[PDB]
Each structure stands twice: as structure tokens, then as C-alpha cells.
Amino acid sequence: DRICTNCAAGTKGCKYFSDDGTFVCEGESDPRNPKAAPRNCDPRIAYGICPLA
Incomplete structure (x- = not known):
């Protein structure tokens, strides 16, 4: 499966x-503006790990 996300x-x-x-x-999404427009599915990303530096 691949989540509908991107950079x-x-x-x-x-x-x-x-x-x-x-x-x-x-x-690197800005945490001020309501994330709605930048929500296009990237047919390359499958999963994103947050607890990782």
C-alpha cells in the first residue's frame, strides 16, 4: 500500500x-497553514516515518 502523501x-x-x-x-509542510491543498498522492511514497531523525 502507498499513502497519499508527498514531500x-x-x-x-x-x-x-x-x-x-x-x-x-x-x-516539510508548514505547521501554520491548514493543510488541504498540498495533499496530492505521490505514486512513489509508500510510508513515512516520523520518530526518526
Whole structure:
């Protein structure tokens, strides 16, 4: 399965990786504006790990 997220859609701090294991990109969404527009599904990201630096 692959979540409907991406680098912009992803929460800042959470590292998004693909299903294979390849690192896609870390989320860097601004925590001020209501996240709604930047919610396009990226057919590359499968899961994002937040508890990881």
C-alpha cells in the first residue's frame, strides 16, 4: 500500500520512504497553514516515518 502523501504533504520531521525501502524525501509542510491543498498522492511514497531523525 502507498499513502497519499508527498514531500510537501508530509509533516515536517517525518521521513517518507518507498515500499521497496528507498528514501523518497522528508516532509516539510508548514505547521501554520491548514493543510488541504498540498495533499496530492505521490505514486512513489509508500510510508513515512516520523520518530526518526
